[PDB]
Each structure stands twice: as C-alpha cells, then as structure tokens.
Amino acid sequence: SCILPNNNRHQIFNTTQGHYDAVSFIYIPIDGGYMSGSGVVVGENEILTNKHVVNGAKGNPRNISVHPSAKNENDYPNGKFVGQEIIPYPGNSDLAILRVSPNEHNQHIGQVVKPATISSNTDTRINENITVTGYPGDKPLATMWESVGKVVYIGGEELRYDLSTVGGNSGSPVFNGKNQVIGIHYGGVCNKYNSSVYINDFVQQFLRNNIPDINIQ
To answer: Do 64 and 129 fall within a single domain?
Structure first.
C-alpha cells in the first residue's frame, strides 16, 4: 500500500451513510501490539478482506475484531463482530472471506449494515474513476478515509490504480462510480501503482459458492 503522486483522500465522518456502512475496520491484537486492516461486509455473516490480513490472527479467527462503519477509536456505531471462520480464496489472489459471529444482541453483521453490492465487472475498464475506502494507518486509529483515483491496469485477478493507500488499507473495497465493489485492495508496488484482487468470473464463483445471499449486480 503506497502513497502515489495522486494522493487525493478525505475522511468519512458519516460512516453509516450510503455505501460507506459496509466498509469495515479490522483489529487483531498481537503480543506487544496490534495489526489493523480493512474489509467490506458482503453477506449475512461475511466480510471480504485479504489473506495476509486474517493471517495476523495466526489461524485463530476469534483474534479478529470487525467493526463495520467504524468512525474512530472511540466511535464504533455498529460495535464489533468476532471472527468465526476464515475461508481463503483457493486461487492465487490475496483474498479471503471472513465469517464472523453474531454480536451480543444476536444481530448478524449483514443485518446492521446493508451488505455491499458486488459488480459483475462486465463494464470495468482502464481509466475509469474509482475509490478505495478503508482504514489507512497513517491516520488516527479506526478512522475511515476514501481515496480517489483511476484504474490503470486489469489482468486476470489483478486490478491496479493510481490512487494512494497506506498500511491499514489492506482489504479495503474498491468501488466504482455506481458504488459497487469491483475489487479488494491488497497492496501495490511503491511508488508505481496500488493493486487489488479483481473480482472476475472465477472470484465471483468463489463468492457465490460461500455466500449464497451475496448481491452481485
């Protein structure tokens, strides 16, 4: 996750408004600190994020806290949901489904926010205007930031763009202008581009296979 020449980013304060509500903050304690990342609610009990993010839990999903619509370190408007099962993408992309437990009120994560709409990606192209929204670690903890830019590359399961991200953004949803998820940010090449897992037909099948209620448009 790299700061690029295009560094056009702003904080989301109304984090439950519109498509921002499914954007999720991830906190995993380690002995002596914490790993944080990002994700997006896509199903009744499911978020999407990276393999390397959930790996911070060292195989134990109950080390993972998911805070949908997190606004800041003292403001979690939807509380948190604890990891229950890690379902990695069988292919070679840095993509994982995290299934989470209900909360203390027996609410499911996909009930307290609107699950994100997944693009079928039939129209996605080079140079289209997009956003990557999540929890960059150069900002205050658990604050949501949107980063504005353009697609520069599409290939197999990789989509690249020219917009800035930072450690902490891993797992952030990539949104098109219709606020649909076209990919899942995972990293980049500093300071050439940033990159996401592209939700192509094979990744879409993995999603539907594991999240039958998924909303693909």
So the answer is: no
